[PDB]
Design a protein around this ligand. Sequence first.
Ligand code: NA
Length: 308
Amino acid sequence: AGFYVDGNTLYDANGQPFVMRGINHGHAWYKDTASTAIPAIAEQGANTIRIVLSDGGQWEKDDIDTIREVIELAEQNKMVAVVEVHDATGRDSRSDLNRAVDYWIEMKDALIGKEDTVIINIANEWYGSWDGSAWADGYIDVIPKLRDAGLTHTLMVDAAGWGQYPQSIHDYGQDVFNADPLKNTMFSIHMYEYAGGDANTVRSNIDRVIDQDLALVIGEFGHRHTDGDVDEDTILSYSEETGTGWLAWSWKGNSTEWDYLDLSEDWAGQHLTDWGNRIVHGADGLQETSKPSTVFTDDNGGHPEPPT
Ligand code: NA
């Protein structure tokens, strides 16, 4: 137990398809907020929270006791935790990837035993360049190291191109998957203006992964704003049509010029923004479509208990 991937479907530990419907939380930048943000996100109906961690590369490192704390908060609030290291974002450097891999191995004791509730997203947006082969080489190399260190979680691998070059997955995703000796790896696309700018683009980018029988989440995405087009309506409707997961960016704490992407005015989620209301209450949003992982209800799938 726990998560596993078969074709384009992610299954929870009870064999039930699990379609992520949730929210990114920039924990690494606002470490003290966990015990507030995590329940608030759960209160919006998210079944999954993606937790931004730092290995010390660009921000303050999240230590092993912090990792245990956020996992426990996610579990207590009945959300799947997608944990991710954010410091190699946009880096081609294998060294920067290796620091993220070493971090997961370092923190393994916080992760082993939580394979039914935690999914490891190896590195946010590793490999900034617009190609697939060198991106694939990185994961082919490091995935076996994660396995041999004893991590049996479903692994999640971001597309190249800062998450916006999904052709990387279309072309080399199978090669990456095949290098996992546990055959338990899924992929993620980040849909902003390059990978999610219109309906056609959203649908083609999804199809090019899932039609390869590879499992997918839209692990970050935004929305249309003055500066730019992102088609959040098609991300939500087409994800619901296809059983593709998605995780909106982000609960709170964007820089000033990107604060149109904050879902909530407050850490405690009492005052959603227009964007928050679209994600939570709007068409195909969390309230309409999010179902909890069945691991969080311990009823043994309706088994009748013997009479006493
Ligand atoms: Na009895």
